Amino acid sequence: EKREVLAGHARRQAPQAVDKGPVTGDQRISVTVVLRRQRGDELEAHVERQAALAPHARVHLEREAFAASHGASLDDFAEIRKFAEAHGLTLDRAHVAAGTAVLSGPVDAVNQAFGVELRHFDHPDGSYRSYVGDVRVPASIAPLIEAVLGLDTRPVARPHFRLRRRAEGEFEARSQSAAPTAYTPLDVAQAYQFPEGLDGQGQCIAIIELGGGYDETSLAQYFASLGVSAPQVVSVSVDGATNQPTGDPNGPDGEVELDIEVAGALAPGAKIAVYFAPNTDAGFLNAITTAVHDPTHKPSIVSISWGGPEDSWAPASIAAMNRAFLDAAALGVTVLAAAGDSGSTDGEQDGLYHVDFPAASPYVLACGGTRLVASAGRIERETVWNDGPDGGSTGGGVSRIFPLPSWQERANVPPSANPGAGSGRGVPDVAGNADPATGYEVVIDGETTVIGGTAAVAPLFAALVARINQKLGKPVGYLNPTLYQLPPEVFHDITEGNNDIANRARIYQAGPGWDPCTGLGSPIGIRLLQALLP
Numbered sequence: 001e002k003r004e005v006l007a008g009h010a011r012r013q014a015p016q017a018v019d020k021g022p023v024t025g026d027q028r029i030s031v032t033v034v035l036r037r038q039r040g041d042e043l044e045a046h047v048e049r050q051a052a053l054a055p056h057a058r059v060h061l062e063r064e065a066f067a068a069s070h071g072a073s074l075d076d077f078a079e080i081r082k083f084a085e086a087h088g089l090t091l092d093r094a095h096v097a098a099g100t101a102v103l104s105g106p107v108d109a110v111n112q113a114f115g116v117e118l119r120h121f122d123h124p125d126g127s128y129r130s131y132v133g134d135v136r137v138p139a140s141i142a143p144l145i146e147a148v149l150g151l152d153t154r155p156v157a158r159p160h161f162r163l164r165r166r167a168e169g170e171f172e173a174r175s176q177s178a179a180p181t182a183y184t185p186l187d188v189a190q191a192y193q194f195p196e197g198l199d200g201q202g203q204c205i206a207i208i209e210l211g212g213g214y215d216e217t218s219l220a221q222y223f224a225s226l227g228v229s230a231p232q233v234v235s236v237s238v239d240g241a242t243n244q245p246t247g248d249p250n251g252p253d254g255e256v257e258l259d260i261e262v263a264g265a266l267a268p269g270a271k272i273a274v275y276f277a278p279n280t281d282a283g284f285l286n287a288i289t290t291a292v293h294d295p296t297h298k299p300s301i302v303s304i305s306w307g308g309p310e311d312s313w314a315p316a317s318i319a320a321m322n323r324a325f326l327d328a329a330a331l332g333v334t335v336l337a338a339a340g341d342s343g344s345t346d347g348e349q350d351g352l353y354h355v356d357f358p359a360a361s362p363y364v365l366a367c368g369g370t371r372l373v374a375s376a377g378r379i380e381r382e383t384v385w386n387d388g389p390d391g392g393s394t395g396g397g398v399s400r401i402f403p404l405p406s407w408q409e410r411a412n413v414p415p416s417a418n419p420g421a422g423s424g425r426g427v428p429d430v431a432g433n434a435d436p437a438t439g440y441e442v443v444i445d446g447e448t449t450v451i452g453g454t455a456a457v458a459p460l461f462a463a464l465v466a467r468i469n470q471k472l473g474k475p476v477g478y479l480n481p482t483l484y485q486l487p488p489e490v491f492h493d494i495t496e497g498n499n500d501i502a503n504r505a506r507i508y509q510a511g512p513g514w515d516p517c518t519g520l521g522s523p524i525g526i527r528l529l530q531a532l533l534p
């Protein structure tokens, strides 16, 4: 019958990608379809509505009631199964609350079902399969499908951490005022006045990982060296991915282990659930929906240190991710994400500034990066993290996908620096120490070293939220609107520096109040808690 284009799936060949022929032989391949769901408008409105309410008197939805009220319908899954069967695909697994389904079949079947021709591509960052053109499905099913992910398997995200390269002191003079010292997460938390007497007991922090793994020896050695009891850590497999260390310190293991060590050191009473998934748009989405809707571990917080330029994703994939973050906000789950570690250009050399996703989502607490100089438990100096082209810098900027939220509009978010300007959601929301030169001591694959990157800030603040949730007795959930309504005295304002590592324009620059390098600044823990208490 007639076919219909599914919006947001158009793709031209990627820059630097080389076509290596059609995918054939017909091995079995899997994709994730995102279905329409019941009462989608009400869901968005409910969250957008609760904004005018302090998170300690709001009404969030419950996981057990969510599927029936806002999940995809069984009638719709039946139609998706009919569509699958009619094209040689199988509906392998349904996720009712999240409103998604995994379908698999030989390439010819996937090609036919979605109106694409999958091709092999070689690229400097890794070979993958993808399509050039658009996705078209039978008109009869088109209304039921909002997105198809996994057709393109290019690595979708980068873990936003960096290993320290320089540790040696100044020749004929060893001083301390910005380096070459390092901190434990506890030292940083003290500088940010995290509320004490709290360890996150009763909370579960979900940590999303798109590669690598952790080993118990590195973790045990780390916590023992701090003289603290280690948190309970469990691994969760998504789409067949598992806890699989590779042994490379600059590989995904570095991210996995720093995430656990930073969050665990500060909220050792929290259960840390680590969700492993493939590094593809489908894997990333499935890791987030699995954690957000997890009936077993029931996380109250999700920490993400992986991401990619918002323009490197298919629009339909970003929309599906954003919907999963809307679910988290509706369910009272806080989602934090590193804002990027490659400055205002986010690792792209096309002559444009780019912000990183998921940080760009209005439903995510975007975490920027600073260089922190602290001593005797106090902040002596805190500036924008910018160590140049090869050293990295905090992500930050103006989204070209998401409009400026009403709750963020009074902050000093500027128009985009790109040609044409234009308003958009400002990145980041808050910031914390991320400079490897004033980094965090960690144990990665058995060795003691120092790391930085905004990848450390998401777990740092995830632990802060866990402590605050413990004190409040109930989860704070979606915090963004609240943060922008709080008095400025709740934050340590960063006013000096810029996150431009591409040119001399000082792209974006810090200043009094909100800026596109550090957002509202570093939270002052005890003040934030006090402001959230009834």
Ligand SMILES: [Ca+2]
Binding pocket: 493, 494, 495, 510, 511, 512, 513, 514, 515, 518, 519, 520, 521
């Ligand atoms: Ca500022």
